Amino acid sequence: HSHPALTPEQKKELSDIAHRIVAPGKGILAADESTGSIAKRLQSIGTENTEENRRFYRQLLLTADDRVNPCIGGVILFHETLYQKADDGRPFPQVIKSKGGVVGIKVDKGVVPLAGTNGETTTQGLDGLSERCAQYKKDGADFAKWRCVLKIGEHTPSALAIMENANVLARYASICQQNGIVPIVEPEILPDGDHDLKRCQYVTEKVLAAVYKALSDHHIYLEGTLLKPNMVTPGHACTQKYSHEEIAMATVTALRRTVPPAVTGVTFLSGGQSEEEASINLNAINKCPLLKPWALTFSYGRALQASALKAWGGKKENLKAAQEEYVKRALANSLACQGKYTP
Amino acid sequence: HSHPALTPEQKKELSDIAHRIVAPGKGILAADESTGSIAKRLQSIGTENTEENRRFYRQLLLTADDRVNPCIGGVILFHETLYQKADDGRPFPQVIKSKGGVVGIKVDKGVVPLAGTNGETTTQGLDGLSERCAQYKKDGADFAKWRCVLKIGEHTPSALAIMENANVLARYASICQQNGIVPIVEPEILPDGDHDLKRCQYVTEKVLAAVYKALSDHHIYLEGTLLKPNMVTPGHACTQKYSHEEIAMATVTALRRTVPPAVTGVTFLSGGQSEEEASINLNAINKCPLLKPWALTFSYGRALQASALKAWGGKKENLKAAQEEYVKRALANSLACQGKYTP
Amino acid sequence: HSHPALTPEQKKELSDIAHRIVAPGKGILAADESTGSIAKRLQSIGTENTEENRRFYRQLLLTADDRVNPCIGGVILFHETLYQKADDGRPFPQVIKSKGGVVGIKVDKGVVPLAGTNGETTTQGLDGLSERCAQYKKDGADFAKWRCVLKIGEHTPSALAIMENANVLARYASICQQNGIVPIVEPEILPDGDHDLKRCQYVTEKVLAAVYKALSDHHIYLEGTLLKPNMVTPGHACTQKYSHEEIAMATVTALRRTVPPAVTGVTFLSGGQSEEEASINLNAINKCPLLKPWALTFSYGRALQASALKAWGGKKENLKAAQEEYVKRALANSLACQGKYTP
Amino acid sequence: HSHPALTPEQKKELSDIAHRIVAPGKGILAADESTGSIAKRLQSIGTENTEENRRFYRQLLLTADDRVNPCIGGVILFHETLYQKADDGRPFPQVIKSKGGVVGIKVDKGVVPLAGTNGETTTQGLDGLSERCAQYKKDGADFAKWRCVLKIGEHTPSALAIMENANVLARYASICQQNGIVPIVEPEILPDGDHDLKRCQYVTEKVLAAVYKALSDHHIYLEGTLLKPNMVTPGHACTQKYSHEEIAMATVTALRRTVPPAVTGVTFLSGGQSEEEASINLNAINKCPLLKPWALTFSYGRALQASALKAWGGKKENLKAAQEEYVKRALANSLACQGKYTP
């Protein structure tokens, strides 16, 4: 029968964190990039990838002006950054908390191939995850992030890929909630290929249906979770063109058909679209006339950080210029998630 | 990939019907009872069960005062009643339509045992259902009703019962939508046994999760469907007592965790609770402070009809007394589904 | 937990029938064709389709020489034929039983479209099936037949088609076994399209895996069932050519990977291959060096009947010529299912 | 469609290993116990648990007399033992290979709780498993072992426990076969509680059905796998008593209803029954008159090792006495897996 996964007090705690992250006007800075991931972005400057450079850049983002406090509800950190300190010696989790944000951590170990499929993958990192989550919890992290990747192709995503990725997501979410950490469920559908908007909407609805069925099977408390999907958009190679209102209608329609109202918030990923494009799409999604029972906001790594990373150019003289790039982009997305953003 | 089940115009038609049924203040009169089902209720008088008596009683309900027009959004008919005419010679579908209602039909053939379970059943009636639905559609019916029954017990509802009933519901819903008829999905959980409110909430959430996963698998258009669940209530034999706000919170919580926002409306069944109790619970559900993206209204056979059936007592002299019983109850539930009902 | 679907005596009865049908050297004559199905075959003569002609032709097949007694373990009848009598006035079930055969009946009502798929279908006929099976049981039928059809295509068979057809098969099999009738599970994969042998083997293994998972879920007693699959063969339009040993290896390999040893027998369908080709393939399957825990035999409508139907030509003078065509083909397949058939 | 998980040469390699392990008369010594697991067994002596004592004891088992060569087809090692050397300096993998055995390794990281269940667990250890398997493969291991644990209780094993454990098993098996290692699938059903033989048979059939459906979904090559189930036996606390022929009939019946013939072999676990009891049950299983398309043999940790561990008593003087205990037990089980063992 019912052997409750969570006590009422555990649920109180999870839902308080979740509402705190997505509170009106707020979104998530995704600062989580590994040393292999951030290497590409430091090469686009010519700054070499060092503990000191990575640390200084994330200090740039986290220590920025007091105007980003109402904008940023949470910050996702990579493992090593969680234990780094700013110049003044404050730990980065404390820096984030002092600005009113919630600290978050990337707990997945990356993707591995699924044999017998066409380039399909699943995500690993469940081993020892409970101990890791307990440690992260006492080191200041209140939420976690796990990335599953699905690609649209002729035979993909297959039944196996959808089933396996949904199962692993539900398993991760269960462990996180047992440790008092709000899981962010991120079933990313890559925007690669020439598929059109209808096919992305179809696949997104199938993936989300499987995800919430798996979360039901694993007894996940949905009020203590967040969703991080792709926007429904055509593939990069698609010739047909779509307005922002059509992308917004496709996105909100896909979410209304799958995501139950109990889910606290939907934090979209930018997924390889430009900064302005991301803010405009998020704005259109929040103006869509359909009823939207959850918060619709941003979780943006690159769409927040790109102009700041260019303005910085690796040289320490540019600190305030870079920080004002980032602040402008954070204010833009803060207005977009309220539907108030006009360029 | 995606081979669309429905054209955009078919979807337009289905969603227009569905919004028409559950429009604010409106609910469904369930007038559908077989000749074996209505026999019990005509014996509680002592009126014998005849085509003439059944026909006269349903004329009593359908021809009632003009005050029930804003109250009743739809009327579910049994097969033979659909082809019966009132005294003036108008067919009952025309009578219903003239009052502004939508006509509906019970398409299921009843329950059969699932071997290898403990008293669990599934519903039959899919054979030839498409032709039946086409005929009903041109005979005036715009929506259909299918009843699946699940019971709470020590090992029940089992995985097989939930899977099979969800599958048959999705199959029925697909056929109906192919024929232009809005399916009402009714996964009824019987209020039998001593189980408490928490266990009913748990089982209701599992059943609804399976139902919407099956509807996703069968490509059902959710904007063109309605849901008819039980309220979440303790079993009849449960000693523990619950307020109406606790039943309402359990019900709305169970729906927010499962039912996606695209579903047009939720029409509750009374399920063996009294007329006043049904109106009070429906009122409390509609006052619950949780956000409720769908219409929450009534589909009541017995909770609308019981006082009218007693007032009539089988004798034709009582027609207007019976009709005023029914009108009072319809006005009560119309206020309840807006949260405006105070006894 | 376990609430047994069948008593030990019911299981005894089912397994006795099942072993009786597939006993060494024996196979099934599929005489089941509707009046719309047999019309094509009576037009290929120019005999018009009448109760008298159909009845006379099936008398031709059922009354043939005493040499077909060790060859034919069972005969599948259409509904009306079950109630027809031979010239001497014996009912056809009695004629079949006197020759040592088991009587069988087609209980499915045909295929209906699955909306949202590409030309995929499911089979109907579960409504009232239990009463029909009880009646057939007391009218002499000891086994039943249900045909599910799956087609290979670019996106087919889809997950929905496989799931739905497996579910309906399991449901039918459950009802039949509750009534004391051995179900024959027939998941036919059509040999249409240009797909090669590997793809047919892949799809056949997926379909059979889903079928036996569904039969496990529905508590089917496998010792009381038979399997009627396609042989694994390339599509009709496939240019690549395959020997009989390669078709046999693909078939037996597909069955060893899916079908549990408890299944009593596998009765192959000819599926649009000629009489000689069917006997040669069945022979090669029974000579394959892989271990084969079940009986491997034939269930052939057209591969038994085609030369007899031509020899008869609709004119009553040819009775014994037609019957000797049929007898020769029955002896050929009887040797093939023992691996003893050399042309 | 079909994107083959394995080339034909990879399949050749896997099936050669699998047939080599279970070849007639041969079984598996399970020497895999962690330092926390072997501690209990070294305390039952009073030998303290040290690298030297563990190493010496496993040398005792692996270096035993030449009579155990036809008895032992494989040896499962714990991680550290794989890198240990015998007295003469030969690595243990080489010692095992020289005696004609196949080397195997335990790749699972243990069980973790499933939240929302009643004491149910799943197994972890998939993270980085592919690299570990590649390393083990070049360090001499040809097969792997993964232990999933299910317990019988009033509501257990639940749907979630069966689904999750089957999924993880299929995932492990896929990774192993990609690396050229034969996975042994071990869904252990604990013999705890008062449940009788029928209930264990029911649960075992459900678990194995789910396991092989998952292995089909993940494209596992069954000819390159082995199965390691429990024998079907009553719970430890069950008062009803059963003969060995009834346990054997229940076991073989459960396997015939689930395990497809392609599976190369079934290596039973002793699971807390004595040495003699294990040999007698294995003997009865191999004499059961039902047809058995797979090899039925032993994989025994404790039922091979208990008398040797007592005879050794931790003191080096007893080496040959202990080794002759182990040799006698290995000869007994070698006769049992051929049905030739009479005490």
Author numbering:
A (entry chain A), B (entry chain B), C (entry chain D), D (entry chain C): 2 to 344
Reproduce the article's own wording on this structure:
Here, we expand upon our prior work and demonstrate that one such 200 kV microscope, the Talos Arctica, equipped with a K2 DED is capable of determining structures of macromolecules to as high as ∼1.7 Å resolution. At these resolutions, water molecules, coordinated ions, defined backbone features, and holes in aromatic and proline residues can be clearly distinguished in the reconstructions.
We expand upon our prior work using ∼150 kDa rabbit muscle aldolase by further optimizing our imaging strategies and processing methodologies, including computationally estimating and correcting for higher-order optical aberrations, resulting in an improved ∼2.13 Å reconstruction of this small complex. Intriguingly, these data also demonstrated that the DQE below half Nyquist frequency is higher in counting mode than in super-resolution mode. Given these results, we attempted to further improve the resolution of aldolase by conducting additional studies in counting mode at a higher magnification (73,000x nominal magnification, corresponding to 0.56 Å/physical pixel) to utilize the higher DQE within our resolution regime. Iterative 3D classification and refinement steps were performed with D2 symmetry imposed throughout, followed by Bayesian particle polishing and refinement of defocus UV and global astigmatism using RELION 3.0, yielding a ∼2.3 Å reconstruction. Our aldolase data exhibited both anti-symmetrical and symmetrical aberrations, as evidenced by the resulting per-Fourier-pixel average phase-error plots. The anti-symmetrical aberrations corresponded to the presence of beam tilt and axial coma (but minimal three-fold/trefoil astigmatism). The aldolase data also contained weak magnification anisotropy. Correcting for these aberrations further improved the resolution of the aldolase reconstruction to ∼2.13 Å. Local resolution estimation of the resulting reconstruction revealed the majority of the core of molecule was resolved to ∼1.90 Å. Comparison of this reconstruction to EMD-8743 revealed better-defined backbone and side-chain density overall.
